[model samples]
Target: NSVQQQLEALEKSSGGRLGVALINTADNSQILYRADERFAMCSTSKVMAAAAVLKQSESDKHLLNQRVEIKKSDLVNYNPIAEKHVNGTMTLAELGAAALQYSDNTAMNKLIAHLGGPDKVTAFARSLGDETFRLDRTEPTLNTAIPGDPRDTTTPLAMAQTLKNLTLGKALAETQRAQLVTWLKGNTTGSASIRAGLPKSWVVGDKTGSCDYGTTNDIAVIWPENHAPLVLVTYFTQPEQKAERRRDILAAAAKIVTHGF
Candidate 1:
């Protein structure tokens, strides 16, 4: 069977909807399945927040050096980094790192506030030529994941393409691009999703998102030994809000996609 066939089978076995988009930069070949369907981005949206901050820094040059005092009211749930720094301060760069590397909810909110609003991050995605990505709310609220609700959602194709633009395309300057990649590569989450599907010899950097109804997502840039890089996105969601997340589905989807390379 072809990779697409295998992915379709995996989706069927999982009893949930699955979406995927894989791009081989070396040849520009692509394999897509339900790539236009909407899926809640959850914490995966933090990457765009971090990228927006980096783009802003490109103009100000000293933007990242400035620090913001963390207030108790500014913090949100699942904020491991910001929770430890209440009443303290963290530089803009550190906030970006916390959001990307740790998926800290408070860190993401702080970065969004620093960028002025969620619209700023959406605008940054627009600047990347991605029309399907949007962030409408802050953490906890955005993770509600109401089915068919478009708030804080993105299509697999759009997410994968935007990630490619940032990591391998010309979206950011060399320094900022490297910084974003570094943050993504150091992500402490996503061990059972995309990363679990790849061989240890290959290099990978990814961000993960999780929300109600088994909506789990991962977008990654992969460097296979002796091969050019690949960009892949996988998203899954069950109909029931209480359904357990199946990380194996994402791992299987990724394994099928990478095998094509």
Candidate 2:
């Protein structure tokens, strides 16, 4: 079967919607499956948050170095790193690391607040020429993941394109881009998703997100051995509330997309 056929089969059996986009940066080749469909972004928005911060930092070199004091009210669920630093200070760079590498909710909220609001991040995405990426709220609230609802959602292609611009394109300065990529490469939450599908020989830097209704997403910049980097996005969501997050489905989809590449 072709890649799209294989993905359609996987989507039917998985009991949910699956959207994928794969781009070979070398020649701009692409394979898209439901790539334009909207799905909840969950914590994946942290990548945009991180990128927006880096974009601003390029204009003001002191942006990343600035520190923010974490207040008690700022803490949110799934904030292991942020919880530890309540009433303490963390540099903008530290918050970005916590959010990207660990998906810390509080850390993400801090970054959003630092950027002035969620709209600023949305504005940054617009600045990237991305029309489908949207962040209407911060973490926890943004994780609602309602089926058919477009709030806090992004299309697989838009996300993959945004990532392509940030990492492989010229969205940020070289140093800032490297910093964002470093944080994503060290992510600890994606062991069962896209990273699971790729061989150790391929270098991968990715961010993952999960929320209610089985919304699970992974977006990455992958460097295949002796080949140019590839940007890929895999987004999954089941209709039922509190549905299981099927990491294996994402892994399987990754296998299909990367086959013979």
Candidate 3:
């Protein structure tokens, strides 16, 4: 990946909430530290939502270029204002990209509906039996509509396994996996945390999600030009404090682990 041991130590030098994990993308090797508790997955759930879409598409061998429209009618949010955008159209391809790339709230909601809803995606998660990996939130609209819920979360181990399956090139179809991985390459909001520790030119396929005060998670498949890709998923929260500081800690943790890798 783009991080190193000394760099991670530097991140920890500044204090906050922290947790991180790393796994060999090809072999599921355990290079993890503090990757067990379930924290809020933020928009990271879109990754699974994307997986469900592609898995279904691959099962049917259908092209993903079919256009899907985003309408005000389909929008749902706990906050009242996100429903303002009324009409737009995007390919299933573009929706997935936006959902992942920008962490677009609306894109995820539409994608979930397009993929046949929350049950299908999270069920696919359940199909991968890792008890520590719990995915309790199963609402498509909620991914966008409800920004935070006391009941939503996924364990670090679960997020790690979820990403491990993808990078191993076995979680979804080979062709679709390529497509999904390509789409997931860049939409994280945390640039100064785990990603900050890496060389700017490195190619790291990553996803980061955070709630206002509940959770922060980063899952990335780093394709360092000269070596194997790395799968790292870091999740954290300051159940006793503000979520922003929690992310600072999570970032520090990831920065440390990634540097060592």
Candidate 4:
């Protein structure tokens, strides 16, 4: 009950707006905390989009290596990396890396556009067995929250299962699954989230989503020494929580799951 007690304390600190899902890939052991609560998956939604786009490569064969040109008009505000180098061309793989590793809004938008739009991403999620996962906006519109908007949202359990499918190649081709694992391992974002709680030997590949009012989240695959990697998903909706605080919560949760088991 220590993990539950610790989670309760964390929820109390944030006025009870947090959700977590931890899954062991070795045997599919699971631990859940508010796992059914909905959350806005800011950039974490990109992983779904990425998988959808990569799914195309299974038939196209050349899709991943194909090149695409990006213009200045293709970018929007808040894209620090992609905006700075707009009006250039890169292979589809590079764009995926930019989107995943740097959380580049422009790159993500391009990926969505290439896959035919937000609907394709949402449909892919549904095909993966996550019927509730939604993607209705680009990264630039992440902070634009509406009272009843269910788009761009998912639950911790959905995220955990989606990630599990990606890692296990159940929802994608085996080649694409290996490619995704490698691409995620190179993710440079969210260094302070779940990765902070892990030892240097444990490889943590994650995608982090953040917006105003403590909307902090991270979904990751942690490769523990001599064990199959585990999937950990954490989401927070604390009205006044700071980014660092949410990150600390993720780190603490990671320790609780990794060490306790």
Candidate 5:
């Protein structure tokens, strides 16, 4: 009745349809409770896309303030766009922030556009040893037309590596890691994830993804006291599930790895 028991309990709690991975970034030690097993990447791919953006941004990712247009006509998420649209325009930085903070599809599409499209992103993911990750273009678009590629695809291990490079500043130059950190810190989705059950004051910066019915995931690194910042990814397959229930998976998994609650 230890880690394995905890993981088994977690599966029973979630009805057993889950896969997850949590890593201690400082030492790079990992606690993979079914984390590596692969699944669809939903909006979660934005994190990897964002990382590619950071690596390639000529100005620091933080400094790209060029204005981008977001029309009310472009309203995509359930949230209204009247308040989200800016008067002048949005910078690359603002668009990226909104994408992570609100799961802004329009912003992400634009980001995908700005980054030269999904093929570039897919190529990068392949380079990182995630060969099974597929671009979503081939799949039929059910509701709204998503990026040709799935937002991102990953298994738990591959995702953990991506987070490692991100927190350690390996994804971008030494100067830009701080900016990436700030971007991730802005994530606000309340899912039971690596950061869940930790001190509220503590920040868990990450990217979460879900769409249609196949998958839901929270992938990111958690900043904690004494212990190294932990990277956790929870991927689930539950065709009949509530959004809130899916989020509980994230929070519970987080408790297992960090707070042990």
Candidate 6:
């Protein structure tokens, strides 16, 4: 069974469900495990919202540069980025960065609202090849109560593919794509997940998502000094696996993909 057995064992070890998709962008080969299964998107949906903003910017290039004033009321409790600067004026680009880098709920909700609604983000995501990804609710609703509701969902493969497309210039224009990439590179949220799995010299660009429902997910582009770059997406939905076990499982998966697999 090869690494298939290893991955299966990995899933079992966590006492949880796992979905993964690892793709080689060069030759387009992939190692997929439960890649099509839907999972609660969590903060990973922030990237999709950011993508939609970038897509809209293709027409209105000024959207990225538009001004947004953040009031104290706009700041959400758990958002580190928004909490620090309770009230300030920043460009839409900066707001997007706050969402991507810190997974700031306030920043993400503002972006969604700025684009009209979740429908616009949903349309852009679908247009970019996310067949099953949905962004129906705002960030707060998606975070607090997305259990049976499919309002916010995505598969491992869909997210990886969307990231690949964004990298290949299919989703955003050159400048906007570069901006998105910069934000991803500066993402400080998931350091212990994908970043923990790689060597110090390797470059990793990633976004992470987790929820109170016992889920830990990370999607990233890992560039090793030796091999070609790869896109790795890992997701979990194990109600019993607490934070410690969830993070341990993510680290284990990263190790297997980077070394054993």
TM-scores for all predictions: 0.98, 0.98, 0.78, 0.92, 0.82, 0.92
Summed over model 3, clashes come to 11
The candidate scoring highest on lDDT is 2
Give the Cα-based TM-score of candidate 4 against the true structure.
Answer: 0.92
Name the candidate, 1 or 3, with the larger lDDT value.
Answer: 1
lDDT by residue for model 1 (1-261), tens:
988789888988899999999999998889999999999998889999999999988899889989889999987779888889998999999999988988999889888988888988899899989999999998889998889999999999999999999999989999999999999899889899999999878889999988899988899999998899999999999999988888888888999999845
> Which ranges of candidate 6 are over 4 A from the true structure?
144-148, 240-245
Local accuracy of candidate 2 as per-residue lDDT tens digits, 1-261: 888899999999999999999998888999899999999999999999989999998889788889899889988788889889888999999999999999999999999988899999999999999998889998789999998888899999999999999988888889998998899889999999999998877889999989999998999999998888999999999989979999898899999989887
lDDT of 5 by residue, 1-261 (tens): 676678778878675367777777566677776565656677777766666666667455444676777666555544322236744467777777777777667777667777677777777667655565545531123122122333445577777777767766456676557777787887777445555656786667888777655456777767765566777777775644333336667677667667541
- What lDDT score belongs to each candidate, Candidate 1 first? 0.91, 0.92, 0.63, 0.81, 0.65, 0.79
Residue runs of model 4 more than 4 Å from their true location after superposition: 145-148, 240-245
Candidate 5 wrong stretches, greater than 4 Å? 59-63, 78-83, 86-88, 127-132, 137-152, 191-193, 241-245, 259-261
Q: List the residue pairs that clash in candidate 2.
A: none
Off by over 4 Å in 1: none
Residue 152 CA displacement from its true place in model 4, Å: 0.7
CA lDDT for candidate 3: 0.63
- Every candidate's CA RMSD: 0.9, 0.8, 4.8, 2.1, 4.0, 2.1
Alpha-carbon RMSD, candidate 5: 4.0
Q: In candidate 6, what are the lDDT values of residues 147-168, reduced to their tens digit?
A: 4557688888888888888865
* lDDT of model 5, residue 253: 66
Error of 4 at 160 (Å): 0.4
Model 3, 59-147: lDDT tens digits are 56554788776677666452122343357567777767777777777777777677566666667777655444324454442332122
